[PDB]
Protein backbone atom coordinates (compact mmCIF):
# COMPACT_ATOMS: atom_id res chain seq x y z
CA UNK A 1 0.00 0.00 0.00
CA UNK A 2 1.86 3.24 -1.37
CA UNK A 3 -0.24 2.94 -4.23
CA UNK A 4 1.63 3.32 -7.53
CA UNK A 5 -0.15 6.43 -8.46
CA UNK A 6 1.52 8.42 -5.73
CA UNK A 7 4.97 7.81 -7.12
CA UNK A 8 7.83 9.76 -9.04
CA UNK A 9 7.85 8.41 -12.43
CA UNK A 10 11.47 8.70 -12.37
CA UNK A 11 11.79 8.41 -8.57
CA UNK A 12 9.41 5.49 -7.83
CA UNK A 13 8.70 6.48 -4.34
CA UNK A 14 6.11 8.75 -2.68
CA UNK A 15 6.13 12.30 -4.26
CA UNK A 16 7.33 14.98 -2.12
CA UNK A 17 6.73 18.06 -4.32
CA UNK A 18 4.40 16.86 -7.12
CA UNK A 19 4.82 18.83 -10.55
CA UNK A 20 2.97 18.19 -13.78
CA UNK A 21 3.93 18.75 -17.28
CA UNK A 22 2.19 19.97 -20.44
CA UNK A 23 1.67 16.64 -21.65
CA UNK A 24 0.25 16.04 -18.27
CA UNK A 25 2.49 13.91 -16.49
CA UNK A 26 3.48 14.23 -12.87
CA UNK A 27 6.88 13.88 -11.36
CA UNK A 28 8.56 14.62 -8.13
CA UNK A 29 9.86 17.97 -8.72
CA UNK A 30 13.73 17.02 -7.80
CA UNK A 31 13.70 14.38 -10.44
CA UNK A 32 12.25 15.83 -13.35
CA UNK A 33 14.56 18.41 -12.55
CA UNK A 34 17.81 16.24 -12.64
CA UNK A 35 16.44 14.68 -15.58
CA UNK A 36 16.24 17.86 -17.41
CA UNK A 37 19.79 19.22 -16.76
CA UNK A 38 21.17 15.91 -17.18
CA UNK A 39 19.70 13.84 -19.73
CA UNK A 40 18.13 16.88 -21.60
CA UNK A 41 14.97 18.96 -22.36
CA UNK A 42 12.31 16.62 -22.84
CA UNK A 43 9.41 14.91 -21.07
CA UNK A 44 10.60 11.48 -19.85
CA UNK A 45 7.62 9.80 -20.69
CA UNK A 46 6.19 11.39 -23.78
CA UNK A 47 9.49 12.55 -25.24
CA UNK A 48 7.63 15.57 -25.95
CA UNK A 49 9.91 18.88 -25.66
CA UNK A 50 10.24 20.39 -22.21
CA UNK A 51 11.80 22.60 -19.89
CA UNK A 52 12.20 23.53 -16.40
CA UNK A 53 10.07 26.79 -16.91
CA UNK A 54 7.21 24.78 -18.04
CA UNK A 55 6.68 22.68 -14.86
CA UNK A 56 3.56 23.20 -12.80
CA UNK A 57 3.10 22.50 -8.98
CA UNK A 58 0.39 19.88 -9.09
CA UNK A 59 -1.07 21.25 -5.62
CA UNK A 60 -3.97 18.92 -5.93
CA UNK A 61 -1.72 15.77 -5.76
CA UNK A 62 0.22 17.46 -2.85
CA UNK A 63 -3.14 17.32 -0.99
CA UNK A 64 -3.80 13.72 -2.00
CA UNK A 65 -0.50 13.08 -0.43
CA UNK A 66 -0.78 15.37 2.65
CA UNK A 67 -4.07 13.44 3.15
CA UNK A 68 -2.85 9.96 2.69
CA UNK A 69 0.35 10.84 4.94
CA UNK A 70 -1.20 11.28 8.30
CA UNK A 71 -3.97 8.86 8.00
CA UNK A 72 -0.96 6.31 7.33
CA UNK A 73 2.39 8.14 7.82
CA UNK A 74 5.14 5.66 6.18
Amino acid sequence: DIPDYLCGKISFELMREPCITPSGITYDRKDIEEHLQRVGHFNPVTRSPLTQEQLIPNLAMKEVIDAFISENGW
Binding site: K9, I10, S11, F12, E13, D31, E34, H35, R38, V39, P44, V45, R47
Partner: protein, 152 residues
Protein backbone atom coordinates in the same frame (compact mmCIF):
# COMPACT_ATOMS: atom_id res chain seq x y z
CA UNK B 1 28.64 -5.75 4.08
CA UNK B 2 24.66 -5.54 4.86
CA UNK B 3 23.08 -5.61 1.18
CA UNK B 4 21.83 -1.90 0.59
CA UNK B 5 23.48 1.39 0.80
CA UNK B 6 21.40 0.94 -2.49
CA UNK B 7 18.83 3.45 -4.10
CA UNK B 8 15.34 2.92 -3.01
CA UNK B 9 14.17 2.93 -6.62
CA UNK B 10 16.50 -0.06 -7.26
CA UNK B 11 15.33 -1.96 -4.19
CA UNK B 12 11.86 -1.54 -5.22
CA UNK B 13 12.29 -2.58 -8.92
CA UNK B 14 14.15 -5.56 -7.74
CA UNK B 15 11.50 -6.60 -5.60
CA UNK B 16 8.62 -6.18 -7.94
CA UNK B 17 10.59 -8.34 -10.39
CA UNK B 18 11.08 -11.19 -8.15
CA UNK B 19 7.36 -10.83 -7.30
CA UNK B 20 5.78 -10.51 -10.64
CA UNK B 21 8.68 -11.89 -12.90
CA UNK B 22 8.34 -11.25 -16.69
CA UNK B 23 6.84 -14.34 -18.32
CA UNK B 24 9.65 -16.49 -19.92
CA UNK B 25 12.62 -14.45 -18.49
CA UNK B 26 14.31 -15.40 -15.05
CA UNK B 27 16.35 -12.47 -13.58
CA UNK B 28 17.87 -12.28 -10.03
CA UNK B 29 20.37 -9.94 -8.49
CA UNK B 30 23.89 -11.15 -7.81
CA UNK B 31 23.79 -12.01 -4.01
CA UNK B 32 27.39 -10.75 -3.85
CA UNK B 33 26.53 -7.37 -5.92
CA UNK B 34 22.95 -5.89 -5.67
CA UNK B 35 23.44 -3.89 -8.88
CA UNK B 36 24.27 -6.79 -11.16
CA UNK B 37 21.56 -9.04 -12.36
CA UNK B 38 21.74 -12.57 -13.67
CA UNK B 39 19.37 -12.81 -16.59
CA UNK B 40 18.05 -15.75 -18.51
CA UNK B 41 15.69 -15.11 -21.60
CA UNK B 42 14.00 -18.06 -23.12
CA UNK B 43 13.78 -18.17 -26.90
CA UNK B 44 10.30 -16.89 -27.99
CA UNK B 45 7.92 -19.36 -29.65
CA UNK B 46 7.78 -18.98 -33.42
CA UNK B 47 11.05 -16.93 -33.29
CA UNK B 48 14.11 -18.93 -34.76
CA UNK B 49 15.53 -18.93 -31.35
CA UNK B 50 12.69 -21.15 -30.07
CA UNK B 51 14.07 -23.97 -28.53
CA UNK B 52 16.79 -22.52 -26.37
CA UNK B 53 17.57 -20.27 -23.50
CA UNK B 54 19.97 -17.44 -23.28
CA UNK B 55 22.04 -15.86 -20.57
CA UNK B 56 22.31 -12.30 -20.41
CA UNK B 57 23.53 -10.04 -17.78
CA UNK B 58 22.37 -6.69 -16.66
CA UNK B 59 23.98 -3.96 -14.58
CA UNK B 60 23.10 -0.75 -12.80
CA UNK B 61 25.47 1.84 -13.33
CA UNK B 62 25.70 4.47 -10.66
CA UNK B 63 23.41 7.16 -12.22
CA UNK B 64 20.66 4.76 -13.04
CA UNK B 65 18.11 5.80 -13.62
CA UNK B 66 19.67 8.86 -15.30
CA UNK B 67 21.82 6.42 -17.42
CA UNK B 68 20.62 3.19 -18.93
CA UNK B 69 21.38 0.10 -17.61
CA UNK B 70 23.99 -2.26 -19.16
CA UNK B 71 23.04 -5.25 -20.78
CA UNK B 72 24.59 -7.97 -22.73
CA UNK B 73 24.25 -11.44 -23.91
CA UNK B 74 26.44 -14.04 -22.79
CA UNK B 75 25.41 -16.98 -24.73
CA UNK B 76 26.16 -16.52 -28.26
CA UNK B 77 23.41 -15.78 -30.64
CA UNK B 78 23.03 -15.02 -34.32
CA UNK B 79 21.02 -11.89 -34.80
CA UNK B 80 21.29 -8.53 -36.43
CA UNK B 81 21.37 -6.65 -33.20
CA UNK B 82 23.72 -8.69 -31.07
CA UNK B 83 27.38 -8.56 -31.95
CA UNK B 84 30.01 -11.48 -31.44
CA UNK B 85 30.86 -9.98 -28.22
CA UNK B 86 26.98 -10.15 -27.03
CA UNK B 87 26.72 -6.30 -27.15
CA UNK B 88 23.15 -5.35 -27.77
CA UNK B 89 21.98 -2.82 -30.27
CA UNK B 90 18.66 -0.94 -28.76
CA UNK B 91 17.81 2.73 -29.09
CA UNK B 92 16.77 2.66 -25.49
CA UNK B 93 20.09 1.39 -24.57
CA UNK B 94 21.67 4.36 -26.51
CA UNK B 95 19.61 7.60 -26.26
CA UNK B 96 16.26 6.88 -26.51
CA UNK B 97 17.03 6.23 -22.87
CA UNK B 98 14.57 7.73 -20.39
CA UNK B 99 14.54 7.59 -16.64
CA UNK B 100 10.98 6.71 -16.87
CA UNK B 101 11.91 3.41 -18.37
CA UNK B 102 13.21 0.61 -16.37
CA UNK B 103 14.71 -2.78 -15.91
CA UNK B 104 11.47 -4.46 -16.77
CA UNK B 105 10.97 -2.48 -19.77
CA UNK B 106 14.56 -3.19 -20.91
CA UNK B 107 13.97 -6.85 -20.47
CA UNK B 108 10.84 -6.68 -22.42
CA UNK B 109 12.31 -4.91 -25.44
CA UNK B 110 15.23 -7.25 -25.49
CA UNK B 111 12.88 -10.18 -25.74
CA UNK B 112 10.94 -8.42 -28.39
CA UNK B 113 14.22 -8.08 -30.52
CA UNK B 114 14.25 -11.86 -30.20
CA UNK B 115 10.96 -11.59 -31.91
CA UNK B 116 11.35 -8.93 -34.55
CA UNK B 117 14.90 -9.12 -35.52
CA UNK B 118 15.59 -5.63 -36.88
CA UNK B 119 17.73 -6.31 -39.96
CA UNK B 120 18.43 -2.69 -41.03
CA UNK B 121 20.38 -0.64 -38.31
CA UNK B 122 22.36 -0.80 -40.49
CA UNK B 123 26.91 -5.54 -40.02
CA UNK B 124 27.17 -8.93 -41.94
CA UNK B 125 24.46 -10.62 -39.93
CA UNK B 126 22.09 -7.91 -40.92
CA UNK B 127 23.23 -8.11 -44.48
CA UNK B 128 22.57 -11.69 -44.64
CA UNK B 129 19.28 -11.33 -42.93
CA UNK B 130 17.79 -8.94 -45.66
CA UNK B 131 19.63 -10.85 -48.59
CA UNK B 132 18.82 -14.37 -47.56
CA UNK B 133 16.26 -14.78 -44.78
CA UNK B 134 15.86 -18.52 -45.20
CA UNK B 135 19.58 -19.21 -44.47
CA UNK B 136 19.56 -16.48 -41.99
CA UNK B 137 16.87 -18.29 -39.99
CA UNK B 138 18.39 -21.72 -40.40
CA UNK B 139 21.57 -20.51 -39.21
CA UNK B 140 20.08 -18.95 -35.99
CA UNK B 141 17.96 -21.90 -35.62
CA UNK B 142 21.06 -23.82 -35.66
CA UNK B 143 23.27 -21.81 -33.32
CA UNK B 144 20.39 -21.98 -30.98
CA UNK B 145 20.94 -25.70 -30.88
CA UNK B 146 24.63 -25.31 -30.77
CA UNK B 147 24.91 -22.97 -27.93
CA UNK B 148 21.79 -22.14 -26.25
CA UNK B 149 20.56 -25.57 -25.48
CA UNK B 150 21.26 -26.84 -21.84
CA UNK B 151 23.57 -24.26 -20.38
CA UNK B 152 21.36 -25.85 -17.44
Amino acid sequence: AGSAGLPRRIIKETQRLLAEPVPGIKAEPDESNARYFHVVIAGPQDSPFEGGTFKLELFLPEEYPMAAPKVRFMTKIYHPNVDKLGRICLDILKDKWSPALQIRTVLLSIQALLSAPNPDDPNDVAEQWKTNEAQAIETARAWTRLYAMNNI
